[PDB]
Design a protein around this motif. Structure first.
Motif, PDB file in Angstrom:
ATOM      1  N   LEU A  75       2.738   3.203  -8.682  1.00 23.05           N
ATOM      2  CA  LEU A  75       2.905   2.671 -10.028  1.00 23.05           C
ATOM      3  C   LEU A  75       1.923   3.313 -11.001  1.00 23.05           C
ATOM      4  CD1 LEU A  75       3.345  -1.034  -8.913  1.00 23.05           C
ATOM      5  CD2 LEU A  75       5.156   0.568  -9.583  1.00 23.05           C
ATOM      6  N   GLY A  76       0.790   3.803 -10.496  1.00 22.71           N
ATOM      7  CA  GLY A  76      -0.203   4.399 -11.374  1.00 22.71           C
ATOM      8  C   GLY A  76       0.241   5.725 -11.960  1.00 22.71           C
ATOM      9  N   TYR A  77       1.159   6.415 -11.278  1.00 24.27           N
ATOM     10  CA  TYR A  77       1.611   7.717 -11.760  1.00 24.27           C
ATOM     11  C   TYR A  77       2.368   7.599 -13.073  1.00 24.27           C
ATOM     12  CZ  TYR A  77       0.340   9.450  -7.166  1.00 24.27           C
ATOM     13  OH  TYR A  77      -0.350   9.786  -6.024  1.00 24.27           O
ATOM     14  N   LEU A  78       2.839   6.396 -13.403  1.00 25.80           N
ATOM     15  CA  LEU A  78       3.556   6.198 -14.656  1.00 25.80           C
ATOM     16  C   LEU A  78       2.680   6.537 -15.854  1.00 25.80           C
ATOM     17  CD1 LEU A  78       5.666   4.982 -16.636  1.00 25.80           C
ATOM     18  CD2 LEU A  78       4.862   2.717 -15.953  1.00 25.80           C
ATOM     19  N   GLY A  79       1.366   6.337 -15.732  1.00 30.56           N
ATOM     20  CA  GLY A  79       0.473   6.675 -16.826  1.00 30.56           C
ATOM     21  C   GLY A  79       0.540   8.141 -17.199  1.00 30.56           C
ATOM     22  N   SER A 110       0.861  -1.176   0.000  1.00 29.45           N
ATOM     23  CA  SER A 110       0.000   0.000   0.000  1.00 29.45           C
ATOM     24  C   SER A 110       0.896   1.225   0.000  1.00 29.45           C
ATOM     25  CB  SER A 110      -0.923  -0.017   1.212  1.00 29.45           C
ATOM     26  OG  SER A 110      -1.608   1.214   1.346  1.00 29.45           O
ATOM     27  N   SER A 111       1.215   1.686  -1.207  1.00 31.98           N
ATOM     28  CA  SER A 111       2.249   2.669  -1.497  1.00 31.98           C
ATOM     29  C   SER A 111       2.542   2.573  -2.983  1.00 31.98           C
ATOM     30  CB  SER A 111       3.521   2.411  -0.688  1.00 31.98           C
ATOM     31  OG  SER A 111       3.945   1.068  -0.836  1.00 31.98           O
ATOM     32  N   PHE A 112       3.266   1.523  -3.374  1.00 35.62           N
ATOM     33  CA  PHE A 112       3.425   1.209  -4.787  1.00 35.62           C
ATOM     34  C   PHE A 112       2.090   0.956  -5.458  1.00 35.62           C
ATOM     35  CE2 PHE A 112       7.974   0.828  -4.571  1.00 35.62           C
ATOM     36  CZ  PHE A 112       8.195   0.523  -3.246  1.00 35.62           C
ATOM     37  N   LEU A 113       1.104   0.458  -4.702  1.00 32.85           N
ATOM     38  CA  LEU A 113      -0.260   0.307  -5.197  1.00 32.85           C
ATOM     39  C   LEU A 113      -0.666   1.463  -6.101  1.00 32.85           C
ATOM     40  CD1 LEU A 113      -3.208  -0.770  -2.967  1.00 32.85           C
ATOM     41  CD2 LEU A 113      -3.529   1.012  -4.658  1.00 32.85           C
TER      42      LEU A 113
END
Length: 146
Positions: A7-11, A1-4
């Motif tokens: 990782l979405g910011y890469l979009g 609960s962090s990378f969750l």
């Protein structure tokens, strides 16, 4: 609960890459549209020069010389525009080199924190836990009294 969600910011980064490449590509070959127009206009200037010269020539030798000169001028235009094609190639290659290589800049960290969470999970997983002991329970064998 962090990378969750990290990782979405890469979009956002992916869409920004698309937008930068997008506006570069729109800008590229557009300036080259203008450059081709400029070369076609200089060629049209040359054509007008030679047409006026031929109209005012009225002599066979002059007409033949003007034909040769127009051929030479068109050949020079073609050579310069071929050098220009080299310039489009080189400019676009440089632009792709610059704009792409921006990809690694923030792509490599995300992969690195991916390894971070990976090996943290492996830490929480890879244990191979044990439990040991020893004891000295003796063994007895009866002996014949005789």
């Amino acid at each position: 609960s962090s990378f969750l969600d990290a990782l979405g910011y890469l979009g956002s980064l992916i869409k920004d890459f698309k937008r930068r490449r997008f506006f570069l590509n729109k800008a590229h070959q557009r300036i080259r549209n203008k450059l081709g127009v400029s070369f076609a206009e200089r060629r049209s200037q040359i054509v007008s020069k030679y047409d006026r010269k031929i109209a005012s020539a009225r002599k066979p030798a002059i007409i033949v010389k003007l034909r040769q000169r127009k051929e030479k001028a068109l050949k020079a235009l073609d050579k310069m525009r071929v050098r220009e094609e080299k310039k489009m190639i080189r400019e676009f290659a440089t632009q792709a080199a610059s704009l792409w290589l921006s990809f690694r800049y923030e792509i490599m960290p995300l992969y690195y924190q991916s390894q971070d969470v990976l090996d943290v999970i492996a830490n929480s997983t890879s244990e191979f836990m044990t439990s040991r002991d020893f004891v000295a329970k003796a063994i007895n064998i009866g002996i014949p009294l005789e």
